[PDB]
Amino acid sequence: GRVLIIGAGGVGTVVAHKVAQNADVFTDIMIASRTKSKCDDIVKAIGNPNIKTAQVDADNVDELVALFNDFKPEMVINVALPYQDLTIMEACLKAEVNYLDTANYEPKDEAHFEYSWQWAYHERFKEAGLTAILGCGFDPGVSGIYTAYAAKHYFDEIQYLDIVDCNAGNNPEINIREITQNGRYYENGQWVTTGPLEIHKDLTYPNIGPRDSYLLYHEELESLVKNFPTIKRARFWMTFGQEYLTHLRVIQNIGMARIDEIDYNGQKIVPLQFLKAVLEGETSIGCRIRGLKDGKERTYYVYNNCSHEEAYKETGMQGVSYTTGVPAMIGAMMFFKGEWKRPGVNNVEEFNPDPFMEQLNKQGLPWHEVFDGNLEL
Amino acid sequence: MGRVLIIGAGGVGTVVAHKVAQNADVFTDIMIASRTKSKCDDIVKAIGNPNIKTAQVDADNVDELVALFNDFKPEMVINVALPYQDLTIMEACLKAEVNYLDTANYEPKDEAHFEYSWQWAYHERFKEAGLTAILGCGFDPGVSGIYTAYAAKHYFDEIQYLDIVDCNAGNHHKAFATNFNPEINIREITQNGRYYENGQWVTTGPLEIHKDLTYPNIGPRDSYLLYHEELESLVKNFPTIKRARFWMTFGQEYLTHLRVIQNIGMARIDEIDYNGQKIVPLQFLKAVLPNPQDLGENYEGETSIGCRIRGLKDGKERTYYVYNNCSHEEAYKETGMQGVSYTTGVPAMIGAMMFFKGEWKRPGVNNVEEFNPDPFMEQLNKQGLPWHEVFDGNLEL
Ligand SMILES: NC(=O)c1ccc[n+]([C@@H]2O[C@H](COP(=O)([O-])OP(=O)(O)OC[C@H]3O[C@@H](n4cnc5c(N)ncnc54)[C@H](OP(=O)(O)O)[C@@H]3O)[C@@H](O)[C@H]2O)c1
Ligand SMILES: NC(=O)c1ccc[n+]([C@@H]2O[C@H](COP(=O)([O-])OP(=O)(O)OC[C@H]3O[C@@H](n4cnc5c(N)ncnc54)[C@H](OP(=O)(O)O)[C@@H]3O)[C@@H](O)[C@H]2O)c1
């Protein structure tokens, strides 16, 4: 049960905490990242001196292979940035290490992500007997596990999938890249494109109430549509307050959302990253699913609500880092326990959702089901 | 001597170079020196006069400036670099016995507070050396004080109320851009408002007080009260003034962008460590924002800047409104810049002309209202900034 965490950010902080909380499964833990001091901060916060740390540039396959051959992990949990997905997978192949991440690949010079890059590794991973688990955060991640759970127990055919993500509380480089692209959803065999944050409507969230929700593309639509060909329409919605949208608009207008490197006193700075250097309540994230069971239409809503305060008291991080870090740990737990072992490259919906859902209820993300309700869309 | 040296090759310096080159009878030898020499050479190529010399200089370095001054031997140095360079350039002018003019008074790099004490401190040294320093000779500061001196000289026994009003009614068709150096521009407009009334200076919140004011050829515009450096010297030099305020128009989209820039920390003036390098966020913002110097091509509309003055003549209250409207497109066609660079650059050239012609000769450190306004006002009509007068109208203020 040797696990290596790459990335000492908000998510990695949560993953480390949750891995440490399950030492019967995770007997040996290391945290490696670009800035080692953040790794050591996490170890001190957890209070477990047995967690090892290391500096590594995960853009460098050779550095990674040396680290992997030193610590000898059985799985690496990549919660660095999407840019590191492929170099880490390369190192995993060469050092015969299994793999898990929470976000699929996008190149540094283009804010477009898709699964082709990582799916390309399927046969190499398979012939090496290695398992890769892609997109095992909350969304992507629990959102596809929720959908697999519904398909397994409640639906003959899933026909409409609507993922809803509300942060009702009170990494910006990858975050602002995600939300500024054209919207995109799936309907009747085709991918449909909107303007950025053009389509929106009020959706009512448990314990929160109605919130302005905006349609945008999201990674998991690509694989969920592929893996559930009964789907007639799949969309993803996220809430955005007016002040947030205003700040987002201005940031773009002034040039601080740029993703190319600019030259500033002999140093290569990308405006969006420099912005990062300067930049109560709860989340509610789930899936609203409609389809057929025993010849009749049926609706289903399954969700988690995560309190920012409770997440902070446990891990020092807020609800967005918490909801992503917990499932990443559980994915590794499923592999270590043999519940999720499938040589090749896998999306979460391809595994048995039941043992994962059972752990979510025990590891800080209890989920709730509403049957036969009005899904509002 | 007739030799003039221009420091700063930005938007204002581009205009100043064009305007001095247009008056070769006065300015017989011209040099443009600036931190980045290629921009000096860009200006000379645009003007088409190979006789204009260029040079690289770091105007933060008194030694470098003195060497440049003793080589070129200017009679006056027109400082249109940043306020930060005001004192080092004045130091060098004193050491090399060269006269001085700028369009903005000093603020330290580490504090967004400007005032005249720094430069007034050089008065007796300049005076003893026979050197004249002309401070704040742009449009506002500059023409705004020359307008005031003009009104005091010709139309009032006693001026009592001064309101300077500044509207940029143009459209540069950018989501957001500033009209001059964004670093200096943003530092200025984000401070607390201040004005003068009944013997005291009153502080307001930033952009707290605003009125609808009607601008010639433009109409009503949302106008905001803020401090402006010429209020300090004009209140000093015209004691009869009872109330002095400065107003500038801001559109809603502009204010929205300005608010967000401050909230996200990109208006900060302190240095942060970014990959072992010291970076001032406001200075980084300048790098990505549109360059004011490149806006003229798609700039339409015009500016309107003037002074609304009220006071007594022969015991009766009178009003006076004097202003200039400047077409962004005409400024662009003439100089490649836009109306804010133009309104600032033309009066800087004229102040130097007044010195070269002997009209404005006053050893020491001077604000523009201390000179005879008449010959300056005459040149404004001839050098591209004609002004208009309205007598006894409603000042709305
Ligand atoms: N599926 C979901 O629900 C979900 C939700 C949110 C986020 N995520 C994903 O989670 C990941 C982490 O997010 P976060 O918020 O924790 O980000 P973060 O706070 O910026 O942390 C990223 C970490 O990766 C490190 N890193 C970056 N480049 C590296 C390199 N070349 N070599 C080694 N380490 C490197 C960073 O090092 P430094 O300390 O030097 O900066 C930092 O410690 C991202 O991929 C994000 O897309 C997924
Ligand atoms: N009175 C008024 O009505 C009024 C109105 C607007 C502006 N102004 C003033 O006019 C001045 C010029 O503004 P602008 O918009 O033209 O600014 P700008 O476009 O940024 O140009 C300033 C110039 O100074 C140069 N410079 C900066 N630091 C220097 C240093 N250490 N040594 C030498 N040169 C240096 C810059 O060089 P680089 O090319 O290397 O950047 C640039 O060429 C400012 O002081 C501003 O406050 C006055």
Author numbering:
A (entry chain B): 2 to 171, 181 to 289, 300 to 397
B (entry chain A): 1 to 397
From the reporting publication:
The polyamine biosynthetic pathway used by most gut microbes differs from that used by human cells. This alternative pathway employs carboxyspermidine dehydrogenase (CASDH), an enzyme with limited characterization. Carboxyspermidine dehydrogenase, from two major gut microbes, performs the reductive condensation of aspartate semi-aldehyde (ASA) and putrescine using NADPH as a coenzyme, in the formation of carboxyspermidine. CASDH is a homolog of enzymes that perform similar chemistry including saccharopine dehydrogenase, L-lysine 6-dehydrogenase, and homospermidine synthase. In this study, we investigated the largely uncharacterized carboxyspermidine dehydrogenase that produces carboxyspermidine as a precursor to the polyamine spermidine in an alternative polyamine biosynthetic pathway first identified in Vibrio alginolyticus. This alternate pathway is known to be present in many bacterial species including a majority of the most prevalent human gut microbes.
